[PDB]
UniProtKB/TrEMBL annotation, chain B:
Protein name as catalogued: Superoxide dismutase
Species name: Staphylococcus equorum
Gene Ontology annotations for the cellular component aspect, listed alphabetically: cytoplasm
Family according to the record: Belongs to the iron/manganese superoxide dismutase family.
A Pfam family the protein falls into: Sod_Fe_C
Molecular function GO terms recorded: metal ion binding; superoxide dismutase activity
């Protein structure tokens, strides 16, 4: 069924913004676990065939006794599958969604300022997102491994703010992590996800 | 006076090699400090400005519903870690009232640890694992984020912070290794003190 996807550029491609140690453990351990437990949950169910997008959209209809496992692990798999593809070494701060973000916030810096505040504000483990919601842009956060897909909002950019993704380098300084993040945001893809959005 | 982040009962390097010295410094001076601050800010000239944190956290729904979320999160923060520092101990000794009463319910300390470890490991995202007194009965629960068993009317006599910030520097992804090490620095002299005062 579900497979851990290969990192597009290896572990050192986001230096010095995200450390090379964190990338290997995040990918090889944290994500790997999500995939193993997810496969264990759906192995032998009607879910086994279907895509993680379809499943995370439909958590409410996932059978009782595996709903938690799928939410947590299905989400972990989707969330991190997007993250890897959304981090770029040759990030160019331009394209469709950036045009569309300047059209909605006035400037990219006024967007970042909100995103950063919502990212910093999410108490405990969670993600910060920019989502396409009924054609409009919205900045929402989720706790743990929850994904706005579950609430009919297509995510086009996400940031893991679990401490396991920033603590080796930035320790308690989550802001520095969010600031740094921008340097490796892969807008070529953030676009790709806006186009396919429904 | 309100609230002030308390000194560790020991040095930062006093729990080595079980909890790293870098983590003991940041965890207390930053993480627990920020809580005290953001908390003090939220209670700036209020009904609970001069109330005990044990009272506030156990009566959380009756906190003005416009600062409720900040107090629950930073209030829990202050109490949880305040407990955690006192419940840690260079020279723990596995005996006393709670150890005898654990033996009485679980059959053995090792059976108790196994459940605590499983429940501690199982807690998804950030939170705490607790041994609490629930109406005289002993019970192992976990709570998300900075929530405390007091809010549900159970007194905590032992707590383990399983936020990734409390173990990632040394143990990284391997939370179970951290839970295992914890047992070497649990302060059963304090666990008793807290149980005794369940009264
Ligand atoms: Mn993660
Ligand atoms: Mn903590």
């Amino acid at each position: 069924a579900f497979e851990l996807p290969n990192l597009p550029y290896g572990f050192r491609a986001l230096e010095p913004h995200i450390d090379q140690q964190t990338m290997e453990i995040h990918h090889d351990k944290h994500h790997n676990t999500y995939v193993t437990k997810l496969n264990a949950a759906v192995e032998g169910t009607d879910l086994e065939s279907k895509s993680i997008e379809e499943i995370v959209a439909n958590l409410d209809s996932v059978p009782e006794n595996i709903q938690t496992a799928v939410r947590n692990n299905g989400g972990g798999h989707l969330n991190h599958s997007l993250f890897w593809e959304l981090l770029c070494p040759n990030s160019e701060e331009k394209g469709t969604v950036v045009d569309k973000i300047k059209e909605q916030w006035g400037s990219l810096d006024a967007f970042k300022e909100e995103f950063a505040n919502q990212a910093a504000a999410r108490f405990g483990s969670g993600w910060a997102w920019l989502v396409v919601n009924d054609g409009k842009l919205e900045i929402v956060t989720t706790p743990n491994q929850d994904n706005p897909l579950t609430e009919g909002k297509t995510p086009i950019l996400g940031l893991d703010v679990w401490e396991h993704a920033y603590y080796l380098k930035y320790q308690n300084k989550r802001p520095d992590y969010i600031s740094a993040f921008w340097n490796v945001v892969c807008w070529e893809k953030v676009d790709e996800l806006y186009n396919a959005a429904k």
